[PDB]
Write a protein that binds this DNA or RNA. Sequence first.
RNA 1: GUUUUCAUUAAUCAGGAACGUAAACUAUU
RNA 2: CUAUCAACUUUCGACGGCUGGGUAUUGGCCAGCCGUGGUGACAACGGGUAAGGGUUAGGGCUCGGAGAAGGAGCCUGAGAAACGGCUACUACAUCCAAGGAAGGGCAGGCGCGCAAAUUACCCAAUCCCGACACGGGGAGGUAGUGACAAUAAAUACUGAUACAGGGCUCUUUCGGGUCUUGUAAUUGGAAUGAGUACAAUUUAAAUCCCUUAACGAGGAACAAUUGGAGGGCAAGUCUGGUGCCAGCAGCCGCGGUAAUUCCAGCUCCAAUAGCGUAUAUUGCUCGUAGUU
Lengths: 159, 232, 123, 204
Amino acid sequence: EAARLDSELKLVGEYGLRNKREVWRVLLTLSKIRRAARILLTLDEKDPKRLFEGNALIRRLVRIGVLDESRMKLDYVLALKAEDFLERRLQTLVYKLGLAKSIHHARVLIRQRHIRVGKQIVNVPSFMVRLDSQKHIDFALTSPFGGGRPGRVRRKKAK
Amino acid sequence: HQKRLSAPSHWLLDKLSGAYAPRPSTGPHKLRDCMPLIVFVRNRLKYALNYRETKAIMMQRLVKVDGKVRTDITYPAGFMDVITIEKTGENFRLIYDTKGRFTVHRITDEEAKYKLGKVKRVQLGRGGVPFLVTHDARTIRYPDPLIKVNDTVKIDLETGKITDFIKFDTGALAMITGGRNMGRVGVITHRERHDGGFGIVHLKDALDNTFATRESNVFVIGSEKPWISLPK
Amino acid sequence: SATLDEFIADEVSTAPIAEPSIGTNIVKRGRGLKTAAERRMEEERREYEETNFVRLPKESKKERAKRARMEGRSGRMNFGGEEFRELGEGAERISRLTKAKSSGERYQKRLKVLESGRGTRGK
Amino acid sequence: ARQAARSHDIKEKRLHVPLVDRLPDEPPPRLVVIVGPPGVGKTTLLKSLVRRYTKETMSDPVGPITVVTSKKQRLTFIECPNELEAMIDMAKVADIVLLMIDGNYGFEMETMEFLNILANTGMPGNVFGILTHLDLFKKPSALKDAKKRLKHRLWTELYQGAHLFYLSGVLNGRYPDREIHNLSRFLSVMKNPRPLVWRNTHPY
RNA sequence: GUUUUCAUUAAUCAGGAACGUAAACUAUU
RNA sequence: CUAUCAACUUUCGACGGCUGGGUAUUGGCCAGCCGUGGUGACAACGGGUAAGGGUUAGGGCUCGGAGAAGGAGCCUGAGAAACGGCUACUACAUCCAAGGAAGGGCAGGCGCGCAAAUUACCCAAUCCCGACACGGGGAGGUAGUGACAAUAAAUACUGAUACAGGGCUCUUUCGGGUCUUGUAAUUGGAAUGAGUACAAUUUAAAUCCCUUAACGAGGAACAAUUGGAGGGCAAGUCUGGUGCCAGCAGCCGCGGUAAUUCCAGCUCCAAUAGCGUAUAUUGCUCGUAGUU
Ligand SMILES: Nc1nc2c(ncn2[C@@H]2O[C@H](COP(=O)(O)OP(=O)(O)OP(=O)(O)O)[C@@H](O)[C@H]2O)c(=O)[nH]1
Ligand SMILES: [Mg+2]
């Protein structure tokens, strides 16, 4: 349908994704989380199952940084979306932190091993960066934007 | 050649020693009430790494078990066998814990010299002589004439003679070595006969838990008198 | 008791929980994160290589057949650093635990308002 | 129902055109060609196969070599020389084909030429890819990469899922005995040749 | 209709039993 | 589980007790003597063949008859009625100088004429057997294949200048809507992993992994695919017919193959290391068993 095609094209364009399999992957994990939230809303308030399982779900989503720290209700967990998940991806986080000029530049950098998340370099652009780990995204020490060797085209030109 | 899970739960093996486990060779103590010397050396103490290293320890006269040199690797050493290593100058003793597993205890020569062994049976041997059989299958010729069944004996271990004995008593503290309440150091406070098989004792700990264990599974350790050093 | 044990350690018990330095629980250049259960296993493998310091075979074909089949019969998923457990029998124990865990000054005012004739009338 | 569906699909797979057999009761020796580019070791495989079968160390084996391999059937090995006239002469003759590929060097035009000459003239029953010069390798990751890419290109060339043997070394100037033993396990037990129309009408 | 009696005798039909030139416009309501 | 199984045992003694034999020992286990039993509607007996226990949050984990070509008999040893041997008979089958002599398994391929996972390496760990530290192990571990699935994601990123004036859209169409878009243009920057690869390391020896010096990108390449829809074309070919039209179509044209540089790489849609196709599909009354 044209609505599905235009929606998936807006996702693939707005966040520099490769195909629609990544969109369907995110929509599947989002539907799993939202199904768990609906099943926890089935029960009444102050049931211990709903209390502890909903607190676990909300603390998990706030810790992985999707759900905002302001709103912490299970209705907002139902109101979650795939734009929030693709915003929590690593590639859009490199683009928004401004190490790269565009989202396709960010995917290129993460593929050819320039950025690192915390200590180790990250080869995958779909790395779900958590909220505590959002700040420690920077260029690695072996990268010419970080330091070390001046690099490849630089070496061929400076010879 | 049993598997690591089919090995009993009281000589411990981690996720490390392969899927298989050594079987104890036939000897004084039983099969399911046993710690082999290889599990004592390289799986409990970790003075060794491999089977060949354990063999290179055992074959030279460096490990003595109950005061005699034990050469073969899977020699059974179940309960209260003093294990003297002279190059390290240590003597270990095997006791249990409150959960039901084997425990090792480091000690020197003064408590290493004697063994507290529970009498299995008294009889008249050949030559018209009374003899005494312990749980270590030690038979002592010409014993003291009051040492009856279920009494324990301080064996000399340099000559093997009797030195002292502790009587089966309601009011003497005891150690459990079997059953569903295994390894619980407490005091024998009651004993019920049940003639016709399988009599019991009722026993409480130091802090008021009564339970009924069988007179086979009991083991007398001392009235107060901890003649072996239970670990503090 | 899985969801209940994490509520005590983070909200109830006043003891700080060790967090890893950020890049350490990344498996293969980002291909997975090590969840706090899978990380705690990884020290247990490592803490067994200094005791008598014989090396290990990095899994085998018969363990990988088992543990990767455990994903086939479980509803767990690891969306980020955390685990997201299914709401089946793990949710019923939370109800199943909590049910066994739950198992002469007046007279003076009346005589003090019966003495005075009256205050007034309706305004 | 699905068992009936798979049974019907296999019953339609078993079918062919009803051509005439024209094989006698005492059949002639089946003809094994050893085809390949120059320098690949066709004569070396010939020496090694005849030592496996008849235990005779031939210092210079030429011509067709007939060999008893079973109590019912027997073979004959002919090594095609490096000339196209001999290759086109024997492609209409061959009963089973031993098609040699030169390992690290990859495929050659003589190999592809004989494959499509054979396919255009008449396809026999059994063609076995034999990949040699594997010992002229230094990295055993490059070795399995070359085996995988040569297997897939050969599968595209003749059919999917063929037999591609890997003959590693040259020990005594001959070949390894275990490798040529499994090669002869494959070319010893045999099935009747394909009913080709040219061979079933014209006497050669 | 009666200023009449026994008080479940009853309801339904497998099996079975008695009676035997044509067609052609069509809990209440 | 069953009464479309009510009698069963005494039909190899069926229940005893006495006496012995044999067994490692008890025992109708077997032999002599006699007594009258034994089980069963509380389900024996017969019939159907579809042959679990423990560890308890959970799942997991652990344990669980007959034959060595066919009957018959024998031998060793602590332990076998080993099937390891012998003997005879029976049935195959081999060598021979024709007098004689040795022998009885699994694995693999084909199972159409058309097909698809190694005849891989070692006891190095855990374990077992021996005169015994050394000798020997078909458990075990190591490696190879794999688009049946499943997992992550390369095939490019970013500027400047020059030039063109159109690009896009629709309900309503010889009409309306919106304002920056291009180009096979000219140039410049960087980034680099696939691959190549010295080593060291891993390991029984290797491989993989982790470390890693050195190379490694300009398209005419380090060469993305599978389907669907549509336009444009000749001194070409075919068919129809009240001239020039229409249709099907067209690798095929005058020459020319070292000749040609052409729509120069046609346009759009979908999925994209995956994708398509086929088929299956998703006459009336009375009256008994019975029923209410
Ligand atoms: N290392 C290595 N050398 C090989 C292999 N096969 C063949 N050779 C050598 O290559 C040489 C080629 O000899 P052949 O095999 O007779 O060549 P051929 O093509 O069979 O015979 P011609 O067609 O007459 O050349 C021999 O000297 C072999 O030793 C191989 O698998 N490995
Ligand atoms: Mg030749």
